[PDB]
Structure formats: C-alpha cells, structure tokens
Design an enzyme around this catalytic site. Structure first.
Site, PDB file in Angstrom:
ATOM      1  N   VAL A  11       0.715  -1.179   0.041  1.00 15.13           N
ATOM      2  CA  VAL A  11       0.050  -0.065  -0.016  1.00 15.13           C
ATOM      3  C   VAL A  11       1.085   1.099  -0.122  1.00 15.13           C
ATOM      4  O   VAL A  11       0.395   2.335  -0.244  1.00 15.13           O
ATOM      5  CB  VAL A  11      -1.127   0.044   1.006  1.00 15.13           C
ATOM      6  CG1 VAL A  11      -1.936  -1.256   1.019  1.00 15.13           C
ATOM      7  CG2 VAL A  11      -0.443  -0.104   2.461  1.00 15.13           C
ATOM      8  N   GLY A  12       2.264   1.096   0.252  1.00 13.49           N
ATOM      9  CA  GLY A  12       2.944   2.281   0.217  1.00 13.49           C
ATOM     10  C   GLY A  12       4.558   1.939   0.200  1.00 13.49           C
ATOM     11  O   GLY A  12       5.090   0.633   0.360  1.00 13.49           O
ATOM     12  N   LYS A  13       5.451   2.838  -0.235  1.00 15.81           N
ATOM     13  CA  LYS A  13       6.687   2.857  -0.675  1.00 15.81           C
ATOM     14  C   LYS A  13       7.288   4.032  -0.328  1.00 15.81           C
ATOM     15  O   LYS A  13       7.097   5.101  -1.372  1.00 15.81           O
ATOM     16  CB  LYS A  13       6.877   2.054  -2.008  1.00 15.81           C
ATOM     17  CG  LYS A  13       8.397   1.653  -2.240  1.00 15.81           C
ATOM     18  CD  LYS A  13       8.643   0.872  -3.404  1.00 15.81           C
ATOM     19  CE  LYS A  13      10.396   0.493  -3.959  1.00 15.81           C
ATOM     20  NZ  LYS A  13      10.856  -0.285  -2.898  1.00 15.81           N
ATOM     21  N   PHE A  16      12.527   4.701   2.834  1.00 19.26           N
ATOM     22  CA  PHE A  16      13.340   3.727   3.680  1.00 19.26           C
ATOM     23  C   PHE A  16      12.598   2.334   3.775  1.00 19.26           C
ATOM     24  O   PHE A  16      13.008   1.452   4.198  1.00 19.26           O
ATOM     25  CB  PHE A  16      13.475   4.180   5.308  1.00 19.26           C
ATOM     26  CG  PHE A  16      14.130   5.758   5.179  1.00 19.26           C
ATOM     27  CD1 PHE A  16      15.238   5.799   4.869  1.00 19.26           C
ATOM     28  CD2 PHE A  16      13.282   6.676   5.764  1.00 19.26           C
ATOM     29  CE1 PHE A  16      16.190   7.047   4.875  1.00 19.26           C
ATOM     30  CE2 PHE A  16      13.968   7.830   5.885  1.00 19.26           C
ATOM     31  CZ  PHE A  16      15.377   8.266   5.332  1.00 19.26           C
ATOM     32  N   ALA A  17      11.210   2.384   3.411  1.00 15.68           N
ATOM     33  CA  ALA A  17      10.381   1.063   3.657  1.00 15.68           C
ATOM     34  C   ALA A  17       9.328   0.867   3.020  1.00 15.68           C
ATOM     35  O   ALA A  17       8.886   1.950   2.030  1.00 15.68           O
ATOM     36  CB  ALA A  17       9.922   0.984   5.250  1.00 15.68           C
ATOM     37  N   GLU A  18       8.700  -0.259   2.917  1.00 17.88           N
ATOM     38  CA  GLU A  18       7.597  -0.733   2.317  1.00 17.88           C
ATOM     39  C   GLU A  18       6.491  -0.749   3.161  1.00 17.88           C
ATOM     40  O   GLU A  18       6.732  -1.283   4.551  1.00 17.88           O
ATOM     41  CB  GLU A  18       7.682  -1.967   1.395  1.00 17.88           C
ATOM     42  CG  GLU A  18       8.466  -1.854   0.201  1.00 17.88           C
ATOM     43  CD  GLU A  18       8.980  -2.808  -0.657  1.00 17.88           C
ATOM     44  OE1 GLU A  18       8.785  -4.266  -0.266  1.00 17.88           O
ATOM     45  OE2 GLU A  18       9.475  -2.832  -1.895  1.00 17.88           O
ATOM     46  N   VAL A  19       5.318  -0.530   2.988  1.00 20.06           N
ATOM     47  CA  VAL A  19       4.179  -0.626   3.789  1.00 20.06           C
ATOM     48  C   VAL A  19       3.062  -1.536   3.174  1.00 20.06           C
ATOM     49  O   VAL A  19       2.640  -1.439   2.194  1.00 20.06           O
ATOM     50  CB  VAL A  19       3.336   0.731   4.325  1.00 20.06           C
ATOM     51  CG1 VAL A  19       2.143   0.555   5.305  1.00 20.06           C
ATOM     52  CG2 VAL A  19       4.249   1.788   4.751  1.00 20.06           C
ATOM     53  N   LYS A  32       4.980  -2.047   8.409  1.00 18.93           N
ATOM     54  CA  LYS A  32       5.994  -1.094   7.563  1.00 18.93           C
ATOM     55  C   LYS A  32       7.332  -1.870   7.708  1.00 18.93           C
ATOM     56  O   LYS A  32       7.709  -2.293   8.935  1.00 18.93           O
ATOM     57  CB  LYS A  32       6.050   0.309   8.276  1.00 18.93           C
ATOM     58  CG  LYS A  32       6.906   1.300   7.369  1.00 18.93           C
ATOM     59  CD  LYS A  32       7.000   2.696   7.955  1.00 18.93           C
ATOM     60  CE  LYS A  32       7.662   3.518   7.175  1.00 18.93           C
ATOM     61  NZ  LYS A  32       7.282   4.945   7.543  1.00 18.93           N
ATOM     62  N   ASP A 134       9.108  16.160   7.989  1.00 16.71           N
ATOM     63  CA  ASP A 134       8.863  15.929   6.608  1.00 16.71           C
ATOM     64  C   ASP A 134       7.291  15.752   6.680  1.00 16.71           C
ATOM     65  O   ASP A 134       6.465  14.821   6.042  1.00 16.71           O
ATOM     66  CB  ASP A 134       9.269  14.388   6.332  1.00 16.71           C
ATOM     67  CG  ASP A 134       9.178  13.983   4.607  1.00 16.71           C
ATOM     68  OD1 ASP A 134       9.132  15.160   3.991  1.00 16.71           O
ATOM     69  OD2 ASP A 134       9.466  12.988   4.484  1.00 16.71           O
TER      70      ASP A 134
END
EC number: 2.7.11.30
Length: 296
Positions: A11-13, A16-19, A32, A134
């Site tokens: 659902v996210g990138k 630093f990470a992938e979700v 995450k 951020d």
C-alpha cells in the site's frame, strides 16, 4: 514471540520502507518493513511510536515492533493501525471534501503537530518536543471518521538540549524539497533548535492546509488536485528550483479571491497565509491553529 501476520498488498513505498496491508490472525493491520540497511530509520520511528507521551488520537496508533529473520538477512517491522481511506494526498486526489470535512481534517492535523511540538504532557509534566521535518499530505493518514493522523517519523528530530550545533549543519536540508520552509531553502537557520525547527513544521503544515482547502466544495468551483507548486516545478523538484520559487519569487500556492466568499474558507485562508509567512517569527504556532479551528 512473533505475531501471526500474513502480508496482503503493498500500500506504500517510501524512502526507507515498504508498507503492507496485512492480516493479523485486530484483523487488518499495516506492516512497515525496513531492510537491515535502514535500521536507523526503523529505530527512529520505533522510539516515537513506543513513547507513552506521544500517544494521541492524531498520531498513528502503534501495535509493536519486530525483528524478522529472512533468507536474504533480516527485516525490521513496525506494526500499526491500518487506515483504509489511505494517505491525505491520495484522499484529496480522489475526493472533493465538504466544509465539515475540512474543519475536522484541518483541526486534527494542527492538534497532532501541536502535541508533537509541546514541551509538556496534558498533565503538565515536561517532555522533549519532536519536530516532524517531513510534513506533507502523503505523510498524513485519513481515519474513517475523517480526522487526520500523523505518520512517517523517519526524519523526525527530538529537540534534545545535547544536540550539537555543528552536527545539525550536515545533516543539511532534511525533508521533501517541495514542502521546505524559505529559511530551510535559504540555509538561514541558527542552532536555536527550539521555536525555529517548530516554525519549519508550521510552514509545511500551511501547504497541507492549502491542499485540503483547494479540494473543499465550499470554495465554489474545485479544480483537479495538484500538489503545492505543481504548476511551477517538476515532479521531483530540487532544493535550488524550490528556492527560486519560495524564496527568490516569494511564491506560494494560489488562493483565488472567489475562495474568500465563504466565511469559513476565508478564516482558513487567513490562518494558513500567516503560517507560510517568509518570516518564521510571523507564523502562528500549531497550538494557535488548533485554537482557530475550534473557533470555527
């Protein structure tokens, strides 16, 4: 010791990470995943999510952190609440919001930031402020009740008095160029980490409030969603191109005069305009903004 999780969908990138949306055998959770290389970012977020003084309805709910051995090495996980409506940028791209939605989203965003910035707990005890560094619509989640929720603390800074003045220099400009305050783009800050770093977060918050306002049907005719400065800069703008707009041209996202016909929109616009002032000292605090939204 490890939770019974099944990863479903990416659902996210981020940087630093992938979700992932995942099944917890709650049922739906967000996971995450940070590779070993990004351990520092995982630890930074873990330390905020684990802090009992940073539990707040407008800060993403944390479940647990885990270290998971894999064939290729080891992954570092942060398991949190999952917000199906997704991030605010995606939400505003798809939806035209009501005046009520704007009031709830705007107020909850200001409350979350004011809680991070606060030097005290609601019960009066001292706490070390955090600056997000951020803040942007992709780092804000929309809860089912149409309130905001802050996430993505990988670049956040604890305003610790032991912080070295020289170490904060490079470091350098941290965050997303598009949302950087003019004094950050100008490299014009002092080792006054206190009110000065809080003021940069308030500037970024002003741009987000503009994004929410730009998609509110109370303005009258609503245009397709565009990020701040979308019509002036390229997709991934550099600090130099942003400095030319925000600093040299004193450029800000457009507020057409017709938006001001609605009393509420006029109040929101006057508030966000004060918050993106060139002079950090002329900006309202996140607490001031939270108070103005409660008056609405």
């Amino acid at each position: 010791e490890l939770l019974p999780i099944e990863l479903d969908t990416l659902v996210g990138k981020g940087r630093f990470a992938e979700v992932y949306k995942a099944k917890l055998k709650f049922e739906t959770v967000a996971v995450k995943i940070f590779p070993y290389e990004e351990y520092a970012s995982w630890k930074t977020e873990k330390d905020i999510f684990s802090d009992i003084n940073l539990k707040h309805e407008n800060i993403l709910q944390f479940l647990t952190a885990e270290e998971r051995k894999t064939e290729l090495g080891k992954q570092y996980w942060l398991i949190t609440a999952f917000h199906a409506k997704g991030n605010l940028q995606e939400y505003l791209t798809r939806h035209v919001i009501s005046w009520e939605d704007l009031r709830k989203l705007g107020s909850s965003l200001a409350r979350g930031i004011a809680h991070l910035h606060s030097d005290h707990t609601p019960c009066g005890r001292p706490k070390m402020p955090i600056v997000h560094r951020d803040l942007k619509s992709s780092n804000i989640l929309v809860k089912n009740d149409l309130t905001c929720c802050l996430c993505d603390f990988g670049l956040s800074l604890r305003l610790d008095p032991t912080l070295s003045v020289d170490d904060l220099a490079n470091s350098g400009q941290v965050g997303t160029a598009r949302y950087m305050a003019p004094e950050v783009l100008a490299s014009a800050m002092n080792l006054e980490n206190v009110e000065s770093f809080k003021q940069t977060d308030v500037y970024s918050m002003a741009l987000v409030l503009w994004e929410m306002t730009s998609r509110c049907n109370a303005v009258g005719e609503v245009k397709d969603y565009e990020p701040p400065f979308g019509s002036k800069v390229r997709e991934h703008p550099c600090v130099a191109s942003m400095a030319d707009n925000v600093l040299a041209d004193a450029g800000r996202p457009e507020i057409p005069s017709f938006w001001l016909n609605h009393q509420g929109i006029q109040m929101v616009c006057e508030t966000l305009t004060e918050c993106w002032d060139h002079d950090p000292e002329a900006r309202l605090t996140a607490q001031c903004v939270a108070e103005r939204f409660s008056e609405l």
